Amino acid sequence: GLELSLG
Amino acid sequence: GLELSLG
Amino acid sequence: GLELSLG
Amino acid sequence: GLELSLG
Amino acid sequence: MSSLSRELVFLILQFLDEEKFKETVHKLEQESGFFFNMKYFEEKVHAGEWDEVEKYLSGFTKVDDNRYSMKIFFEIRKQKYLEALDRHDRAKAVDILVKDLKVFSTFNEELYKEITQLLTLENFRENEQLSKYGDTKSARSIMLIELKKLIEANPLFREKLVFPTLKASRLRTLINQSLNWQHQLCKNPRIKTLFTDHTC
Amino acid sequence: MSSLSRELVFLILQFLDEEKFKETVHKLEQESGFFFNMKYFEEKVHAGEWDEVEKYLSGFTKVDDNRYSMKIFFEIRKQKYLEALDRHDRAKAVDILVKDLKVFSTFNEELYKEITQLLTLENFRENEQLSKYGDTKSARSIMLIELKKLIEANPLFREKLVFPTLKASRLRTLINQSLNWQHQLCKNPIKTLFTDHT
Amino acid sequence: MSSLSRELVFLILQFLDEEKFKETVHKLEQESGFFFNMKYFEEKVHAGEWDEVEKYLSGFTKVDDNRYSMKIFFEIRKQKYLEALDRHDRAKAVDILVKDLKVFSTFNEELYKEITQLLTLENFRENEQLSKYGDTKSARSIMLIELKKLIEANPLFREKLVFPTLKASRLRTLINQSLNWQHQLCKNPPDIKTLFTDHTCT
Amino acid sequence: MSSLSRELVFLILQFLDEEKFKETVHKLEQESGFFFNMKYFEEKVHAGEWDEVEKYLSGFTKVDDNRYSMKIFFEIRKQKYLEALDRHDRAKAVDILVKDLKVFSTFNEELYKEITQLLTLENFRENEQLSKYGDTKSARSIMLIELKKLIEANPLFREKLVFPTLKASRLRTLINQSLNWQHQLCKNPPDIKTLFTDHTCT
Numbered sequence: 001g002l003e004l005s006l007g
Numbered sequence: 008g009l010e011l012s013l014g
Numbered sequence: 015g016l017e018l019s020l021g
Numbered sequence: 022g023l024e025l026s027l028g
Numbered sequence: 029m030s031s032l033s034r035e036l037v038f039l040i041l042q043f044l045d046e047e048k049f050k051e052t053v054h055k056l057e058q059e060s061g062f063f064f065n066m067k068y069f070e071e072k073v074h075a076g077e078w079d080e081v082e083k084y085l086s087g088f089t090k091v092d093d094n095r096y097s098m099k100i101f102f103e104i105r106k107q108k109y110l111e112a113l114d115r116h117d118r119a120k121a122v123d124i125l126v127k128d129l130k131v132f133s134t135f136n137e138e139l140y141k142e143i144t145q146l147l148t149l150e151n152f153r154e155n156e157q158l159s160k161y162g163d164t165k166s167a168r169s170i171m172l173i174e175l176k177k178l179i180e181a182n183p184l185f186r187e188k189l190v191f192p193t194l195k196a197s198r199l200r201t202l203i204n205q206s207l208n209w210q211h212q213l214c215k216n217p218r219i220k221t222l223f224t225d226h227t228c
Numbered sequence: 229m230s231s232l233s234r235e236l237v238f239l240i241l242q243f244l245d246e247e248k249f250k251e252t253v254h255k256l257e258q259e260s261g262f263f264f265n266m267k268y269f270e271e272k273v274h275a276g277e278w279d280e281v282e283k284y285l286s287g288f289t290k291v292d293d294n295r296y297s298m299k300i301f302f303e304i305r306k307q308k309y310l311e312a313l314d315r316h317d318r319a320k321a322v323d324i325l326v327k328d329l330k331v332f333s334t335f336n337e338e339l340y341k342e343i344t345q346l347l348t349l350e351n352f353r354e355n356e357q358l359s360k361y362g363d364t365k366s367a368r369s370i371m372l373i374e375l376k377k378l379i380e381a382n383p384l385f386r387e388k389l390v391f392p393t394l395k396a397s398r399l400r401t402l403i404n405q406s407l408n409w410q411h412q413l414c415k416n417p418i419k420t421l422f423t424d425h426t
Numbered sequence: 427m428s429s430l431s432r433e434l435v436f437l438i439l440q441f442l443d444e445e446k447f448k449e450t451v452h453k454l455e456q457e458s459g460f461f462f463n464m465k466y467f468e469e470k471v472h473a474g475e476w477d478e479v480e481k482y483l484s485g486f487t488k489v490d491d492n493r494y495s496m497k498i499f500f501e502i503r504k505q506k507y508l509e510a511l512d513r514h515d516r517a518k519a520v521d522i523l524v525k526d527l528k529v530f531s532t533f534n535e536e537l538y539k540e541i542t543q544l545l546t547l548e549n550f551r552e553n554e555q556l557s558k559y560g561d562t563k564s565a566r567s568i569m570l571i572e573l574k575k576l577i578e579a580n581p582l583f584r585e586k587l588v589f590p591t592l593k594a595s596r597l598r599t600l601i602n603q604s605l606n607w608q609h610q611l612c613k614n615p616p617d618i619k620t621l622f623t624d625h626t627c628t
Numbered sequence: 629m630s631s632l633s634r635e636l637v638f639l640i641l642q643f644l645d646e647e648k649f650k651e652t653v654h655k656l657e658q659e660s661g662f663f664f665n666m667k668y669f670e671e672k673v674h675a676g677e678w679d680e681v682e683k684y685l686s687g688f689t690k691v692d693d694n695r696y697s698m699k700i701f702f703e704i705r706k707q708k709y710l711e712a713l714d715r716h717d718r719a720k721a722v723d724i725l726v727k728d729l730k731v732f733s734t735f736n737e738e739l740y741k742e743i744t745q746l747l748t749l750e751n752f753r754e755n756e757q758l759s760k761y762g763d764t765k766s767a768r769s770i771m772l773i774e775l776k777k778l779i780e781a782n783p784l785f786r787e788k789l790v791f792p793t794l795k796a797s798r799l800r801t802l803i804n805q806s807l808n809w810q811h812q813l814c815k816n817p818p819d820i821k822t823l824f825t826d827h828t829c830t
Contacts, residue, residue, distance in 0.1 A: 021757035027555035055252040206405035457649040604805035
């Protein structure tokens, strides 16, 4: 949950 | 002397 | 042998 | 003539 | 803090706002950590004032307090980084990458690497995941939507997002009463200072 | 503003300081413009925090308000500039020269040229008027002495340099009385300050 | 005398030019100080290569050798400076002012002062004397027009500006003659091996 | 080119060296591509003059000619990069990484990524492979040893690494012979003026 990502 | 100066 | 690498 | 100048 | 003192801060906040001391209001919000002002936050994010954004946030949470507050800072620092790239300031971009973004590497090694590699692109829009980032203005807006959600879900902000409601000038009214209490201990009627108790 | 409201700001200032909200205190001083805090001013000048110095000042005077406040800003921006030259950041020095010091050119044409020409020196102490300049820490101190005088002489600071003196927590004391007036009669003596006690 | 080694340089220069070694031609021009290649100088001035421009000149004259060659360096360095101002590179402009233009500070204090003050103008054409400096390309060409008059009028270049007249490849025919001197001494007879050591059959 | 002509270039190289025209010697080596001067190359590598190093090399090989000449440029640009990091000039370090080192990515995707990530370290000696790089001076030396090997084994350099051996001033000796051959055709045998046209007695 609330994974960090580029988009 | 309120004139601005370098000193 | 001839391939590129860091060190 | 040979004086250095702005322009 | 007592709830007295906490409530007193709120009174002060209302007063300061009414006197239009805008910057003082937000310093107090921040240093007390009692109320998080969305409107203000949005305004600063749109303005790209990242220094102030992180400073205001610092009154309510640290970067590693929880997964919500961690993603909040990450999003902010990512946009900071991309903007730096977009104005082609690679000196600033690297400074941001080391000072701001490195803390997130420990938890995600691979993303940090992927983000680092954006330095070498002509345009970070060459990365497919970022191929959609069209404007500084628009990107900030998109990101802001995401921050609002992250903040509203964050348990450390959950009870801090709604101001109480008071009749106007509650503090001024209370002060008035202290003057009524002082002068009702006077002998006869019928101001001078708030600094010492008033008498006749 | 009333004198009530003005006085209330002072109580609030005392409260904020006691509760250790340091940055809110000085934002309040600045935005109300009621009290100029010398101690704070000195601390910021010594630290060289030039943006904060000018911002704090900006609540009390603008650059062109009078000849006193004009020399104050000039002195600050001159020191900013000399520090830039002194670490040899000529990129910063020229930026300061154009952005910060050019306003003083309009009426001091020659001086602006003389200050500009320091860019071409190996060390600005080659200029005899600046030959007496010893290090950053000392220069800041010297300048600070001059600023304090200029501010104390400035007519816009005239009623602003002295805090009143109060028993501690006067605001809390007043608040307590309101509870006495409210929380008397109908209810004596946890409930709020948000509505009246009954 | 050394009028040999001077002459031998021209021969080598000519050869280098025939074989299209461009950069060796100009290093030699520069390092011998025997021939000043105007055509090369112009090409580099137009291209704005001020470092190559100035180092090439150094093979020929110093800033303080005479009043002509000192106007030569000044005009180049002034142009260098204005160009930095024009691309808004204020950092480069100050460095040029201090390392390169600063030499003229002493006898022209005032000129140096006026020139420094161009940093504070939004566009240096706001100055009176610079009101017509318009374009980089034209500025370089206009200056080059007078630099040329200055280089030709300078006493240190007067004999160095025009190449000698030679049959093409004068150096190769000489080598041919030297080998002919080698082989009319030998018996008995049009077959060469090397130039490193003298030719012997028998 | 004939081998006559090739040999003449070598004579000229000796002449230029004897007259101490230093930069003309190495421009000629470079432009002719006939002789690669290790001694000079080492000197420049130690000095860290990278722009001149790559320019001198460019007279012999380009970056993508072969796997030897590839690793040679890669090593030079890698050291260039590490030095930038070591002086904490991250603006320069990224400029190098994009302009000079990106060419090696196409065929090395992973290494280019690894090298990029060195920007984010406090010190690249935190990387275990680079944990041994102790000095700029020492690093250059270690690297230089590696380049010497790569150059000597590189097939494009293989016949270019040894200067011939000649008596001193071979060119001056040859020139002299040409004068002897000219004057031995004389029927009044003063004197001989110049090398620009053949001498006669008259």
